Backbone as XML, in Angstrom:
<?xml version="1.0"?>
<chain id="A" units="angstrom">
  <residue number="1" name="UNK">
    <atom name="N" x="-103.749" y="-5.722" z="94.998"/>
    <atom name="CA" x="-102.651" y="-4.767" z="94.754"/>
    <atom name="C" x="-101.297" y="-5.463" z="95.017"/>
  </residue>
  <residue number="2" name="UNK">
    <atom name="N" x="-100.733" y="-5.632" z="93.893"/>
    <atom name="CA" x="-98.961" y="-6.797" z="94.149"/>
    <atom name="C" x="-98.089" y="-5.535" z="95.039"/>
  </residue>
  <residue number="3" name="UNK">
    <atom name="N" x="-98.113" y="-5.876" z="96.913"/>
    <atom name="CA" x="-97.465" y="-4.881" z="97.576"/>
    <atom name="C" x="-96.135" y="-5.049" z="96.923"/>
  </residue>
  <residue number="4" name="UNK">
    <atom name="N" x="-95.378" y="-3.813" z="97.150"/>
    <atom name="CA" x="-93.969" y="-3.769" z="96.778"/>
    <atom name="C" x="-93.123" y="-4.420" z="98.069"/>
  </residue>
  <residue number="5" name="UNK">
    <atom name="N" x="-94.113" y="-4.534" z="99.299"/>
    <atom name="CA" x="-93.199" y="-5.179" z="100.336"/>
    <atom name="C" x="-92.767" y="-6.305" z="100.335"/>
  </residue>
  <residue number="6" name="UNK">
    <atom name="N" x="-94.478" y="-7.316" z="99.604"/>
    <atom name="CA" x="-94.662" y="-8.351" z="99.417"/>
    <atom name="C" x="-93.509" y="-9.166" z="98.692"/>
  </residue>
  <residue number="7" name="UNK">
    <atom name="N" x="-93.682" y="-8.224" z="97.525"/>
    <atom name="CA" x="-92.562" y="-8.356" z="95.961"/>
    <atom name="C" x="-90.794" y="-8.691" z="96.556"/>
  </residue>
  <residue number="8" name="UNK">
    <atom name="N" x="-90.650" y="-7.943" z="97.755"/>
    <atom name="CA" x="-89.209" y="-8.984" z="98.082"/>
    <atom name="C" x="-88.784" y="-10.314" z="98.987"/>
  </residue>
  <residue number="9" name="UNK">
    <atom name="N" x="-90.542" y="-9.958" z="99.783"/>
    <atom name="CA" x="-90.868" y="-12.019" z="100.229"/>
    <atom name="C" x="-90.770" y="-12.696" z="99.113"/>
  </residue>
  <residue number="10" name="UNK">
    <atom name="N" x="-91.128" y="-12.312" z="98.144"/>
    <atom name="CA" x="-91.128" y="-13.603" z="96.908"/>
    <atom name="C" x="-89.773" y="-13.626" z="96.317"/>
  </residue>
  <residue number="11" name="UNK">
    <atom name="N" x="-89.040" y="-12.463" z="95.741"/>
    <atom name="CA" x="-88.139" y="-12.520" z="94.746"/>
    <atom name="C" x="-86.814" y="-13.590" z="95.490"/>
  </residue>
  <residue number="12" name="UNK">
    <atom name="N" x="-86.608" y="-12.622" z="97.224"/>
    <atom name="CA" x="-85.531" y="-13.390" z="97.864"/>
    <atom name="C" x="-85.805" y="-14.704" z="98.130"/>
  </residue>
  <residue number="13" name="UNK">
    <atom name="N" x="-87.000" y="-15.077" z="97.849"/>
    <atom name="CA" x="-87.254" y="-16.878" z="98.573"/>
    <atom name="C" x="-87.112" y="-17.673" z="97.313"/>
  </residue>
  <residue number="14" name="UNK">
    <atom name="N" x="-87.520" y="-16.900" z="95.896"/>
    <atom name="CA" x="-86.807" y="-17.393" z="94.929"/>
    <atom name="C" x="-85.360" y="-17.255" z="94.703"/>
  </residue>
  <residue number="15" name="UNK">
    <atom name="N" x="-84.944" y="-16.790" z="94.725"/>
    <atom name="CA" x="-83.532" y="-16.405" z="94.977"/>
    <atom name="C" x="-82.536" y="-17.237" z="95.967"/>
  </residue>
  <residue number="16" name="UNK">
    <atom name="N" x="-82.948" y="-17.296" z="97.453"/>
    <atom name="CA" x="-82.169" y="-18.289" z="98.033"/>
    <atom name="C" x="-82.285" y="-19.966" z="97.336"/>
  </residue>
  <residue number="17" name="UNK">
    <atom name="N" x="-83.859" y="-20.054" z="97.129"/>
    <atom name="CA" x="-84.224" y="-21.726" z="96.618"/>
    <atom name="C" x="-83.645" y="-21.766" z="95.242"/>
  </residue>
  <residue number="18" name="UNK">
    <atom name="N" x="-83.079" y="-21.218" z="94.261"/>
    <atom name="CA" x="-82.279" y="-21.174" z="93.353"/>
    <atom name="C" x="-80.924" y="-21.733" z="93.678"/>
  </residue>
  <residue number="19" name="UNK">
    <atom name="N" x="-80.497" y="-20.764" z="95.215"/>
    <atom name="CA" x="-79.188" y="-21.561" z="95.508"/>
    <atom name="C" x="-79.219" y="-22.877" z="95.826"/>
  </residue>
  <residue number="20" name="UNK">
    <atom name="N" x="-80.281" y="-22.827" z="96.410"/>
    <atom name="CA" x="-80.303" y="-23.828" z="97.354"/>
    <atom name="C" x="-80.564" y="-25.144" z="96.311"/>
  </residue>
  <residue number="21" name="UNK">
    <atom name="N" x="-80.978" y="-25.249" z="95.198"/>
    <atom name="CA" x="-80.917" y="-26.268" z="94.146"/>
    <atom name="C" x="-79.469" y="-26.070" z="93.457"/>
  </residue>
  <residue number="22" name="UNK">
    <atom name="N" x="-78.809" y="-25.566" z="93.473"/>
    <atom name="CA" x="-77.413" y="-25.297" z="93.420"/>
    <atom name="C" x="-77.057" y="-25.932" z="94.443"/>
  </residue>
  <residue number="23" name="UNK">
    <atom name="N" x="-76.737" y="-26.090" z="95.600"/>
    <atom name="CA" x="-76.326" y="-26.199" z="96.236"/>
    <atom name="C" x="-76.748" y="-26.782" z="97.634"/>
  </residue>
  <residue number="24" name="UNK">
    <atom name="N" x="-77.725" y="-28.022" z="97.664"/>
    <atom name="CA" x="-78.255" y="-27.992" z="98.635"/>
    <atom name="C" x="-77.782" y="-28.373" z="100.337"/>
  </residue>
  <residue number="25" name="UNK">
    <atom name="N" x="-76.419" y="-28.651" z="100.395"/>
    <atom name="CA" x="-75.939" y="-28.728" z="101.309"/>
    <atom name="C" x="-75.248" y="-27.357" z="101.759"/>
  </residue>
  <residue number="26" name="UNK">
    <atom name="N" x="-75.580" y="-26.550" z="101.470"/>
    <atom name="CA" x="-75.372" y="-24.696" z="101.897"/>
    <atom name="C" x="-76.305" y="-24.461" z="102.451"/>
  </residue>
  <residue number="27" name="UNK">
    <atom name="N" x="-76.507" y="-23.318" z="103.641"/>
    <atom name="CA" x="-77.459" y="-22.560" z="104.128"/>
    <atom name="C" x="-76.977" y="-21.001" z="103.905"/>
  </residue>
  <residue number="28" name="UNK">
    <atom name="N" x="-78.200" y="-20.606" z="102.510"/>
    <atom name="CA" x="-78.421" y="-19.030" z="102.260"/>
    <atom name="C" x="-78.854" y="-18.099" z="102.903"/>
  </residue>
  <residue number="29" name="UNK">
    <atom name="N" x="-78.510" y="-16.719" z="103.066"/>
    <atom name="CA" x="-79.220" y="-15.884" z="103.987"/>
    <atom name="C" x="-79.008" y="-14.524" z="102.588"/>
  </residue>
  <residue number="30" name="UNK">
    <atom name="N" x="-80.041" y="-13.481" z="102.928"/>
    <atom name="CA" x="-80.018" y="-12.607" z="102.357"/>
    <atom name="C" x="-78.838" y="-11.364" z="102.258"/>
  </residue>
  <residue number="31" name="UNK">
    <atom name="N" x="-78.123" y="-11.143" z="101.365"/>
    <atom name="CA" x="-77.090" y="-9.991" z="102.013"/>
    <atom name="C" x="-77.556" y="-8.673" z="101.170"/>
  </residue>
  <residue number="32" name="UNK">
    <atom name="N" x="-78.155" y="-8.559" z="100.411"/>
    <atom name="CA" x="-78.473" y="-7.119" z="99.862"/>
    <atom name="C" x="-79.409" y="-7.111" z="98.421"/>
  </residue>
  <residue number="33" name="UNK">
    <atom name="N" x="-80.336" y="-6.105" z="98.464"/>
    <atom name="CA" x="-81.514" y="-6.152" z="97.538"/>
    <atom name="C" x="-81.277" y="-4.795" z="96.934"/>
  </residue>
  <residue number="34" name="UNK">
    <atom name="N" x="-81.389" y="-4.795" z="95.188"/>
    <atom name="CA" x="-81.471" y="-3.728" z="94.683"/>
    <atom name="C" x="-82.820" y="-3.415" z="93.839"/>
  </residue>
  <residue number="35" name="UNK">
    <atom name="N" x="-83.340" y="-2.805" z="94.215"/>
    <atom name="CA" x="-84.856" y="-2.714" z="92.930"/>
    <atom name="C" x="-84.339" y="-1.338" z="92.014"/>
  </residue>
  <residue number="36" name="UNK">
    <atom name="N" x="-84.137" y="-2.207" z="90.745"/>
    <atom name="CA" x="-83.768" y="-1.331" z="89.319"/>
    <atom name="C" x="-84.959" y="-1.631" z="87.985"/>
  </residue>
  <residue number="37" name="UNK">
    <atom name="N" x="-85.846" y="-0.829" z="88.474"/>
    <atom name="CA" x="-87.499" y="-0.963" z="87.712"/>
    <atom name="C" x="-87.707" y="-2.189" z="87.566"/>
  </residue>
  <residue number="38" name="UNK">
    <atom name="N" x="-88.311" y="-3.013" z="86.688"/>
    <atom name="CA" x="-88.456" y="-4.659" z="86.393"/>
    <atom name="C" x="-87.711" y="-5.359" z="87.483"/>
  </residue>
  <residue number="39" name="UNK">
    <atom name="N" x="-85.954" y="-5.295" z="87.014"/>
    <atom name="CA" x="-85.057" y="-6.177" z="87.375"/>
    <atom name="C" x="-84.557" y="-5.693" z="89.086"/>
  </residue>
  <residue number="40" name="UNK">
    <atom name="N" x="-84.819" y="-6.697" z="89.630"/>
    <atom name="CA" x="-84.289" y="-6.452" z="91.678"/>
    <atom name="C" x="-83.087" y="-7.554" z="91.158"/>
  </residue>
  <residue number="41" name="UNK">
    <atom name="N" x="-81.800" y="-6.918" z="91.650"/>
    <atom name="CA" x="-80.642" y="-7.435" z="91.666"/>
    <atom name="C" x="-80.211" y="-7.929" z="93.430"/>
  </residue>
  <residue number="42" name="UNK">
    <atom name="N" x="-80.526" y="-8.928" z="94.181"/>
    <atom name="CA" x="-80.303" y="-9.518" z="95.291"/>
    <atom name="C" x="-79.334" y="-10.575" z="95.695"/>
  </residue>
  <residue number="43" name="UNK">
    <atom name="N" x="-78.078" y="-9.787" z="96.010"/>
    <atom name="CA" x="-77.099" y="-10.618" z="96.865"/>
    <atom name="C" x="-77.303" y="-11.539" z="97.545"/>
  </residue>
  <residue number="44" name="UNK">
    <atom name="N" x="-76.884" y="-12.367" z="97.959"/>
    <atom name="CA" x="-77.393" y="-13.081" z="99.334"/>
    <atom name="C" x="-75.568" y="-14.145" z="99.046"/>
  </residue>
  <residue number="45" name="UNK">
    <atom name="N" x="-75.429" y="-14.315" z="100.617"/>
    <atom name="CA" x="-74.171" y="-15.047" z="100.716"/>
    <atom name="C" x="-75.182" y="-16.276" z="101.077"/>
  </residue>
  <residue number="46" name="UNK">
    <atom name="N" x="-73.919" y="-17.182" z="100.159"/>
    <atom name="CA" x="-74.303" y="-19.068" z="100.782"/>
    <atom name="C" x="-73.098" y="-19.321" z="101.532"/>
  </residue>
  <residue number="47" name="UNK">
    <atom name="N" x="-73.280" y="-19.766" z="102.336"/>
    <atom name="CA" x="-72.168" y="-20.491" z="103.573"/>
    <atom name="C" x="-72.101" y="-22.485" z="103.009"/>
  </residue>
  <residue number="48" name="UNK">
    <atom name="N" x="-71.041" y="-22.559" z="102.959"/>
    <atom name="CA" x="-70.566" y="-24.400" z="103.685"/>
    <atom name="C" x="-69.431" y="-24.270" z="104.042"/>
  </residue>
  <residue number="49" name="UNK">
    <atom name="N" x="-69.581" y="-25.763" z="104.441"/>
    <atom name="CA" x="-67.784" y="-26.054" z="104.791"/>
    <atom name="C" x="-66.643" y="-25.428" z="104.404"/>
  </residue>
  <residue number="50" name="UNK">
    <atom name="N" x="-66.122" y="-24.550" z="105.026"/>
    <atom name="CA" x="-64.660" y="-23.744" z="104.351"/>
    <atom name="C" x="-65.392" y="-23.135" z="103.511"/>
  </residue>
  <residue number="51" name="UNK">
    <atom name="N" x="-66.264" y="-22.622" z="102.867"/>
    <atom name="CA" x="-66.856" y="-21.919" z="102.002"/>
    <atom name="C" x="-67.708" y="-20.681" z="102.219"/>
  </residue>
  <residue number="52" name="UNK">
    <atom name="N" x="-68.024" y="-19.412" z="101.461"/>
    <atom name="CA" x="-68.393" y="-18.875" z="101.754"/>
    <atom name="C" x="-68.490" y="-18.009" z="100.579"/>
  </residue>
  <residue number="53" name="UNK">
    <atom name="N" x="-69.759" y="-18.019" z="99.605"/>
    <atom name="CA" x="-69.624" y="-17.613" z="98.169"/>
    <atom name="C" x="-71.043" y="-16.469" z="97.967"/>
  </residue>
  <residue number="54" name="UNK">
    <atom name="N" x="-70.516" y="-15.374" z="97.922"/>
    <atom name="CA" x="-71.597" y="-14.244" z="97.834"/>
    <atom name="C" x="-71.941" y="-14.233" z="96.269"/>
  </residue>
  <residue number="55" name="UNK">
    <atom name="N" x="-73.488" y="-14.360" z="96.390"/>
    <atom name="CA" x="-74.016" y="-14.659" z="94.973"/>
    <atom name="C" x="-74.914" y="-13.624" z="94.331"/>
  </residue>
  <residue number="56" name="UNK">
    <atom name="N" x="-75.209" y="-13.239" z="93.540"/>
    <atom name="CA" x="-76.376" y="-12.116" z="93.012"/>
    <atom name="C" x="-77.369" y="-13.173" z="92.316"/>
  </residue>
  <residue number="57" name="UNK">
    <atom name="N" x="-78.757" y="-13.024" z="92.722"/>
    <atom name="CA" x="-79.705" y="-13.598" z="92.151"/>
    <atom name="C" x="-80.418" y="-12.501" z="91.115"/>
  </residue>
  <residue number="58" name="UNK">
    <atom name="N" x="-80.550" y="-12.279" z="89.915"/>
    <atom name="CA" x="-81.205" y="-11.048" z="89.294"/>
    <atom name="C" x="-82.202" y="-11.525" z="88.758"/>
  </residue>
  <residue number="59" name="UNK">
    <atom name="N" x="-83.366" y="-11.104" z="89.310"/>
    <atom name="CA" x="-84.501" y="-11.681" z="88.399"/>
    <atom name="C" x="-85.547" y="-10.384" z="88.474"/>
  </residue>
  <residue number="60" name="UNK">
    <atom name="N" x="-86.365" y="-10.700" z="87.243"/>
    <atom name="CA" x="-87.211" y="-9.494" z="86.320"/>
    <atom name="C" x="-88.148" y="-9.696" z="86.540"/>
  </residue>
  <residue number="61" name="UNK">
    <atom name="N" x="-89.548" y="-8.780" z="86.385"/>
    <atom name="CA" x="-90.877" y="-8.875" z="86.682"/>
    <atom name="C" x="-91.270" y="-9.222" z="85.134"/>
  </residue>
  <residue number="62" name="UNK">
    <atom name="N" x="-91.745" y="-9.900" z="84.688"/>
    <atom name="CA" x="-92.680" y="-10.604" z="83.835"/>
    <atom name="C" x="-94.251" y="-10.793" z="83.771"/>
  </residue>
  <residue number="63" name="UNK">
    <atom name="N" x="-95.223" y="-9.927" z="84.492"/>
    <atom name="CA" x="-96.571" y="-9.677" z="84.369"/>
    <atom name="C" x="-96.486" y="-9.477" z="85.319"/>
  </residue>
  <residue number="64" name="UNK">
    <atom name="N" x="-96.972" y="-10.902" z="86.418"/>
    <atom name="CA" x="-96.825" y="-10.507" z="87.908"/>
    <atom name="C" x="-95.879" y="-12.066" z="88.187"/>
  </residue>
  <residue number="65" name="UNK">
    <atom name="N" x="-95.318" y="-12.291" z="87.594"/>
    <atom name="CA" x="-94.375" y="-13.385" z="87.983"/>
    <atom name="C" x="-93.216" y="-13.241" z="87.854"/>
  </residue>
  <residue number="66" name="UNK">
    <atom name="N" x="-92.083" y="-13.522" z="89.210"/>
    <atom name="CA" x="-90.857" y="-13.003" z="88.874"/>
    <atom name="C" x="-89.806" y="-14.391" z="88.556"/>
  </residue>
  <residue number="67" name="UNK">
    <atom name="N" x="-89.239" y="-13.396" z="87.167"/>
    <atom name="CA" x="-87.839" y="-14.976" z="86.592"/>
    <atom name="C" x="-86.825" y="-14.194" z="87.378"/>
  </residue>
  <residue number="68" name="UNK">
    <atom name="N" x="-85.671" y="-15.205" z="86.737"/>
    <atom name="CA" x="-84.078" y="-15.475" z="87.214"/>
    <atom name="C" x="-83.522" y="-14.951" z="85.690"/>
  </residue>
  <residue number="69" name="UNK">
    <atom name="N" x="-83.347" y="-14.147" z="85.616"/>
    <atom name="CA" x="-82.064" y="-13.731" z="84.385"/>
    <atom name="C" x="-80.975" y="-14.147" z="84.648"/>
  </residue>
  <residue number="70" name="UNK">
    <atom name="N" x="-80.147" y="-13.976" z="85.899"/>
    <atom name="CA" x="-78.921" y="-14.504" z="86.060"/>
    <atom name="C" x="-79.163" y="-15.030" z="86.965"/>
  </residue>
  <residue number="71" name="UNK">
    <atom name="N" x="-78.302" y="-16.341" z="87.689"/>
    <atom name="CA" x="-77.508" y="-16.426" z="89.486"/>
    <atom name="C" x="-75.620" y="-15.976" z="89.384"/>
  </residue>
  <residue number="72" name="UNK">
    <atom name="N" x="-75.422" y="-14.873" z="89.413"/>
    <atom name="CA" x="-73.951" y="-14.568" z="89.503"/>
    <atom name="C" x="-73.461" y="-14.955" z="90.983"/>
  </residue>
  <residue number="73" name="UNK">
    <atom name="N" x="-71.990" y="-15.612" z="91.059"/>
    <atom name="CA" x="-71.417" y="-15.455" z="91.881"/>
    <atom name="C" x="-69.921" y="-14.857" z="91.858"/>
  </residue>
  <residue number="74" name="UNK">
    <atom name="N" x="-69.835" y="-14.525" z="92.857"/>
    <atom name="CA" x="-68.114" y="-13.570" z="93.380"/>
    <atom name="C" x="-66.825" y="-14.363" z="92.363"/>
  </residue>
  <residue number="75" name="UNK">
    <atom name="N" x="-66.489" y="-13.698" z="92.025"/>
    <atom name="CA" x="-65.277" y="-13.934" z="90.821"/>
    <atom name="C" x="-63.641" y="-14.259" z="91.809"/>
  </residue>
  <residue number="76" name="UNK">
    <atom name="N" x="-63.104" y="-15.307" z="91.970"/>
    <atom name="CA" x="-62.446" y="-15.925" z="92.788"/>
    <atom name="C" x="-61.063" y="-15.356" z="91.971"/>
  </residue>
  <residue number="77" name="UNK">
    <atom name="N" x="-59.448" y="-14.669" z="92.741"/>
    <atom name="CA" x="-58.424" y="-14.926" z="92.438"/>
    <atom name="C" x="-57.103" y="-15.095" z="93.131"/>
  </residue>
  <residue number="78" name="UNK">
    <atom name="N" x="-56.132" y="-15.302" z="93.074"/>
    <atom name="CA" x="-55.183" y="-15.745" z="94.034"/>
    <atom name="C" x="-54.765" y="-14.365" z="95.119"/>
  </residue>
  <residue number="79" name="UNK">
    <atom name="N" x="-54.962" y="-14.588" z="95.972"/>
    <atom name="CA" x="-54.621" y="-13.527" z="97.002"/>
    <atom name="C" x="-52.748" y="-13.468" z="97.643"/>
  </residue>
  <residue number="80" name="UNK">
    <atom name="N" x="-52.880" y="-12.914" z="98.510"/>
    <atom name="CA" x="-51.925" y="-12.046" z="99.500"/>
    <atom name="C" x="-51.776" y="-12.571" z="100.974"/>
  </residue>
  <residue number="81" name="UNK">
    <atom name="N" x="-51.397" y="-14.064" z="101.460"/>
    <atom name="CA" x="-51.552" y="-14.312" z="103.279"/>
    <atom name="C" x="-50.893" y="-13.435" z="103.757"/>
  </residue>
  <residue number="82" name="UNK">
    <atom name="N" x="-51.952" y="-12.758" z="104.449"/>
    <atom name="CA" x="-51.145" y="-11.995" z="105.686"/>
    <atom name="C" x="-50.662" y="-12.473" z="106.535"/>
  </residue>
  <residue number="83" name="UNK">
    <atom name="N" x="-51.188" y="-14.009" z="106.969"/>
    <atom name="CA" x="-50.551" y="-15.073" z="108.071"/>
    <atom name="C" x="-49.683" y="-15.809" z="107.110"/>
  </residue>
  <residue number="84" name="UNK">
    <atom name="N" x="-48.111" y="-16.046" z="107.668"/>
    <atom name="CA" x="-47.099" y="-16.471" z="106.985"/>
    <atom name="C" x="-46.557" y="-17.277" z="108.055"/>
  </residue>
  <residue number="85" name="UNK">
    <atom name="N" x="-46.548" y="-18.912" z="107.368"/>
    <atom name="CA" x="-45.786" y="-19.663" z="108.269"/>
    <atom name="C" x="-44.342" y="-20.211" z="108.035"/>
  </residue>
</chain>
């Protein structure tokens, strides 16, 4: 029986190791899981140096094997310092 508990040990460990071939000098942690029938849409922030880039891993159920449709990350634009020197 493919547990549904099971189903987000796998999707998020695919999901971080996605970044993590992206990026292998980052350490990923999970930040948020959505299950939308097939497709689980799972956040997870990657940390480095001065960095800190919250990513969506979306991947679909395909029989009993889960793909990567997207790896989205956070859309970057010029901000506002509140610290002014």
């Amino acid at each position: 029986m493919p547990s549904e508990e099971e189903e987000k040990r796998q999707v998020k460990q695919v999901a971080k190791e996605k970044l993590l071939e992206q990026s292998p000098n980052s350490k990923v942690q999970v930040r948020r899981v959505q299950k939308q029938g097939n497709t689980i849409r799972v956040e997870l922030e990657l940390r480095t140096n001065g960095k800190k880039e919250n990513y969506t891993v979306e991947v679909e159920r395909q029989g009993n094997t889960w793909t990567v449709k997207r790896i989205t990350r956070t859309v970057g634009s010029l901000e506002h310092h509140h610290h002014h020197h």
